[PDB]
Design a protein around this ligand. Sequence first.
Ligand SMILES: [Cl-]
Ligand SMILES: [Cl-]
Ligand SMILES: [Cl-]
Ligand SMILES: [Cl-]
Lengths: 348, 340, 344, 343
Amino acid sequence: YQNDDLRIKEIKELLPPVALLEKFPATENAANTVAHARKAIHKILKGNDDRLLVVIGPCSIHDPVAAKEYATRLLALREELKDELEIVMRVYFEKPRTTVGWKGLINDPHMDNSFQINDGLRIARKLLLDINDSGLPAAGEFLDMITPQYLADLMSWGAIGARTTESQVHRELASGLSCPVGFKNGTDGTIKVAIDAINAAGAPHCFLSVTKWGHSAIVNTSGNGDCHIILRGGKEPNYSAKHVAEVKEGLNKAGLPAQVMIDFSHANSSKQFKKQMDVCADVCQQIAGGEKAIIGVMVESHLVEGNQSLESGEPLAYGKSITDACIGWEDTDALLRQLANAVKARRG
Amino acid sequence: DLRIKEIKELLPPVALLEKFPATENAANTVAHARKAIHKILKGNDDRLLVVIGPCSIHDPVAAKEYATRLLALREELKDELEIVMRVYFEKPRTTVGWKGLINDPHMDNSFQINDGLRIARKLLLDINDSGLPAAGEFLDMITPQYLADLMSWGAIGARTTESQVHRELASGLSCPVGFKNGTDGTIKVAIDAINAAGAPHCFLSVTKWGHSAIVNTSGNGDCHIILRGGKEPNYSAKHVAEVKEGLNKAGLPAQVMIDFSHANSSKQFKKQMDVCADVCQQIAGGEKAIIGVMVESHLVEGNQSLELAYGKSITDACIGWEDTDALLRQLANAVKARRG
Amino acid sequence: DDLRIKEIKELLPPVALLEKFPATENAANTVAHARKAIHKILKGNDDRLLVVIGPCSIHDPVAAKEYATRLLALREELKDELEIVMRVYFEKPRTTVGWKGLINDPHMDNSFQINDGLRIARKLLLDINDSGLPAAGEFLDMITPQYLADLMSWGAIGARTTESQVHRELASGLSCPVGFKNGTDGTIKVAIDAINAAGAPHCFLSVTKWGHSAIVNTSGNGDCHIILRGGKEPNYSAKHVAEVKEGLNKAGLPAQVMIDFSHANSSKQFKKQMDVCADVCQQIAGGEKAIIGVMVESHLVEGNQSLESGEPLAYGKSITDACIGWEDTDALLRQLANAVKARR
Amino acid sequence: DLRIKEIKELLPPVALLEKFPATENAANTVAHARKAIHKILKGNDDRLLVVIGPCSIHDPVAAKEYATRLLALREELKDELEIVMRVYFEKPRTTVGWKGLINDPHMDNSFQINDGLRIARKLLLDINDSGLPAAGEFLDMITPQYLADLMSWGAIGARTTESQVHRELASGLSCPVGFKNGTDGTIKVAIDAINAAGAPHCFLSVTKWGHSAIVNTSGNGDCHIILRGGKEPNYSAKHVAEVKEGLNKAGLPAQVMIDFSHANSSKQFKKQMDVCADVCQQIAGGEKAIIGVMVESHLVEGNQSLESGEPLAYGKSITDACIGWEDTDALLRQLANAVKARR
Ligand SMILES: [Cl-]
Ligand SMILES: [Cl-]
Ligand SMILES: [Cl-]
Ligand SMILES: [Cl-]
C-alpha cells in the first residue's frame, strides 16, 4: 500500500497464545497455586487478612536453571513463613529500558540479538508453569497488551510499570486482568497518577486488544477491584511514615482504602541494592509499630548479590542479575524473616 | 477471563485500506507533506510547520467545512508555513466523557468501533484528497494501523511519552512524530523518547491482517520535542534557549514545536493569540529553533458540553475562524521577517 | 513440512472484499427476489423455466458487462415464462496444465494475482446484480465462495466433485439453491445422494469471512436439484427424463430436473445445443412439467479460442469451452419461452 | 449467513504441532520411510510396500498394541517388505454413522473436533516415535495440516480422486500419495489425478496458522495408482497387465498398489486372504509392477456396531470388517516369502 511500512524492516510469524497454552497447560497443582494466591491477595486487599504480600525475586529472568534454584529456596521460606507472609516470586521476562541493551528473556532469550521471541515465549511459559506447579505463586509486569496473554493465567499478581501508570491502554488492560494489579507512583513521586489508574482500572472498558488466537478484537472488561498503589520513590524515597500518612489520606480522599505496597528498590533505595535492607528496617518498624496500611512490599533479589554486564562478553556468573543489582540469597533470607517478625509484632 | 465480559469482531486494517484506499492526490498530499516536514526538521527549510485544527473531531461535516477554509489559507501562506490540519479522533481524559468518534461514533455508548474506523478513515481520506495534510495522535498500537498511511505528522499522547511500547511505535511510523515535555515542564522524558524512537527495535505488534507478529523497525529520525508547558508556560524566549541548550547537550538538533494551547495558554483559548504574539516576535527576531507550532482551532470559538452548536468544540475551548485567520497570517509575516 | 510447498503469499480475507464492494440495495434486491423465484419454481408454485445461461467462464469483464446488458433486456421481455439468470463463472476446473480462470490468474500470464482476481470478480458480480440481472456461480472449493456467495442467486457443484463430502457439506450451508450434476457415466445415484446430504445439517471445518479456519455448523439446503448433463451419450430425451423422474420419486425427492444443453449432452459440440434445445422444448410443449431449469454455454461470439500469453485475444469469444453466439442465444431463449407459454 | 447455525473456534495447526512436536525418532521414522517408498517407486528397491492396519482408529490403546505387534514384524520382514501401519481416523460414508475419531473421538455425536485432533496427532506421534511409519487418508484440505508431517504415505479419498482441489493438495504433500481407480474399475481418473498431482499449482489453502493464503506447490512425482476393484475385483494378473499397459501408454511408470479389501475382497474380510494368495503367486513368479498392497487388519477379526450406553469388544473394528492378527501375521509372511521367491 502507499505511504506504508517505510520504517518497518521485517515482519515475522508469532505463535498465537493458544499454541503456548496448548503446549504448556496449567497442571492441576499450578492452577491451584494461581487460584489460591489470587484469593489470598484479594483477602488482604479487602482488609480480612493481616499478613503481608511479598513480591520478591530477580529484576528479571535470564537463566531458567538459576531461576528454578531460586524458586525452590523461596518456596521453602514461603512454607515456613506463610502465617505472616504471602510470598510471591517475581518472575519478570522483560526489563524496560530507555537506552539500547538486552530487553529480557522473551525478546531475546539467547542474549545475542537473535530475538528468538517464539523461543522466549516457550521458555518463559515453561518456567512460569514449572514454578507454579512446584507450589510457588508468580508475579509479573504488564508492559504491553500482547505479551500478557501468553502468561496471565499463571500470574497471581502483576504490576504496571511506573512509565505506563498514566497510559490509558495499560489502565484498560488492568481492568480485564484476572489477577490483582499494583500501580506505581510517578517517577517524580506523584501519587495522583496511581490513584487515577486504580479508579480507571476498577471501571469497565471497551477497547481494542488481541485474543488468544493472535487476532485483534474489540474487548469489553468488567473492571478490576483488586488494584492498589506501589510506593517506589520519586526524586527522594517515599517509604517512610510521613509519606505513608500522605498516601493513606490521599487514597481515602479519593474513596479508596488506605493501603500500600512499598517497593524497597528502584528510587526507594536510590538504585543501591543494599539500601533495600535499610528500607526494610524502617518498614518493619512501621509494621511492628502498628501500621496496618502496609499490605505488601517488593524486593529485587537473586541467588548472588549485585549485577554483571552482558556487554563485556565475559561468561555470565551463575545466579547473578544482568539488569538491576539485587540482594543475594543470605540478605534475602534475613529480609524475609525480618518482615515475618514485623507482621507477627503488628498482630500481638 | 473473569474480567472479560465480551469479545466482538474487529475488521482488520486491510479491510478499511481496501474499502477506503488512498487516492493518488491523498497519497501525494501525504508524501509531499512528510518530505516537507523532514526538510524543515533537517534544517533545510526556513518555513514553520503549523499543526492546527479542532481539539477533537466530533462532526465530519464541520470537520470538512473547516478543512476547506484551512486549505485556502494553506495555499495562500505556503511560502512561509507548512499548514497541516489537526485531525484527532479522541480527547484523552481520566474519568467520564465521550471517548470520541472512533470508540463511539453513534454518541450513544454503543461503541461501534468498526463504524467509527470507517467514519474516521473516510474523513482522513477526504481531507488528504482535497490537498490538506493531516496530523494525528497515536494513543494505542492498534488504531494507527488503520489511519497512519493518511497522516503526515503525529504526536504521542502526553501520558504515554514515557512508555516503551509507544516509543517503539514511533520508531516504525512513516511520518514525523512529536513528543510532549513532562507535566512539570522538564524535557528529559521527551529527550529519552526521541532517542528511543530513533533506534531500530524488535517487538510484538498487530499487522494490517489483524494478526499479531514480530515486527522489526528501522528507527525514526524525524522526531522532535513539543513544548506544551509545565506548571508555568514554556513558550517564552528564555524557555526556548534553555530547551535548545538541553537538546544540544543531549546531541539532539536544537529544534522545538510550541503548543499555543493547554497550559501554555493558561487554559484560556483566546490566550493562544498572546502565545502567537510572543512566538512571532521570537521568529521575526531571528529565532530559527522554532520549527513548528500547534494550535487548537475550530469554526466557532470556545467549547460546549454534550450535556448542539455547529463548529464548536464539545471538548477543550478553541479559537474561532477570525482569530485562526489572523494567527496564521501573524506567523507567516514573522517567517517573512526572519527570512530577510 | 513444505518440501513441495514453494511459496506462501498473503490473501485478502472475505471481509476485505465485502467491505470494498458492498452489495447495493439493488443487487441485494436482485439476489433476494431471484432466490425466492427459484424456490417457488423448485416447490411447484410457478411454471416458468429457470435459465442459467452465460459464458463458460469470464476472462474479460468489459465483454461480460455487454453480455449482461443484452441478457438483461431479454430477461425483462421473457419474465412471464423465463427466470433468466446469467452464468458468471470465474473458474474452469481443468485436469491439464492451463488457465484456471479469472480469480486464479486474471492477467492470463501465470502471474497468479489472485487478490486482483477476487477484486475483479466481485466488482463484476456486484455490477451485474445492481443492473437487475441475477447471477449463477460454480462452487469448486470452500475458500472462494466466501468472497462471492452473497451475490449468487444459484450455484452448481462441479460434476467432478458431486460425490465429494466437503462439497456436499458446503452446499448445505449456502444461502442459495444448488444444482448437482450426474456422473460422467449417466449414473444419477451420486447426484441423488448429494441432494440428500446437502438437505441435512452438518458440522465440518471451513474458512470464515475473517480468513480463519473454524468449525462450522450448517442447517441443510432443501433448494437443491439434479442437473442432467449427459455421460457416455446424452440424456436429455423424455426417455432419459422418465428414468430420472422415476429414480427421484423412488427416493422421496421432487421429480424435478434441470437439463444442461452443453458438455456431454451436446457431445462437446456448441452448435448441437440448438438441437438439445429442440428436444427439451418439444417435451415442455408436450405438456411435460418436470423440467424446471436449463443451462446453456453462451457468449457474444460463437466458438472458442486458444489463449497465448502476451497475445491479444479475439473479442466476445470464450477461451475455454465453445459457446453459442448471441444470435443463437436470443433464439434459444425465445424458443424456451414459447415452449413455456405452450405448457399452459 | 442464512444456512450457517454456529461458528466455533478451531485450534490452528501450530497449536497441535507445538503440543505434539515430532521427537527425533518420529522425524527419522517419517524421513526414512518417505525415502524408502520413493526409492521403491523409482525401481531401485525390489521390496514390497505394505500399508496395513485398521479400517479406522477408534481406540488409541488398541492402535498402540497393534503398532507394537506390527512393528515387530516390520523388523523381522524388513529385507522383503516396507511395512507402514494404516492409521485412518474416518470411515467415509454418505450413510448415517460414527464420523471417525477426529470428528467424534468420544463416539457419542459430541463432535469434539479439537479433542479429536489432539488425540489423532498424539497417536500418530507415538506410533512414529516407536519406529513404525504411518499411512494417512486425505479427505479434506484443512485436516492434513495437523497430521501430514507424521505421515509417510497417504491416499486420497476415492470419492475425491477427480477433485481438482484434492489433486492440488497432493501436489503439495511431502509424502507419496496413492490414487484409487474409479468405482467402475476405470483407471483414467487415477491417471489424470497422478498427472495433475505431478504438476506445480497455485491455489488457495489454509496455513499452519489457521489463515487462508495463496499457496504454490512444487508438484509430487511420488504418486501411483491403487487398484481397489470396480464392479468386479481387479487384482488378477490379467487386470495388472491391462493397467501396466494403460500406464505405459500414458507415460507413467507401470506400477500399481493392490488394495486387498473392499471390492477386491467382495466385501468379505476373509477373502483378503485369497487376494493375498493370488498376488503372492504373481510376485513369486516375477511380477515386478506390484509395488504395494493395502490390507484392512486389526488385532481381532470382523467388526461390531457402536451402541449408546454399551461397551465394545477390544481391538475390533467398529467400521469395516478386518482380518485379525493371526491372519495378519500369515498374510505378511506370505507376501515376504513371495518377494524372496521373486528374487
Ligand atoms: Cl536468572
Ligand atoms: Cl468537529
Ligand atoms: Cl469473457
Ligand atoms: Cl482402534
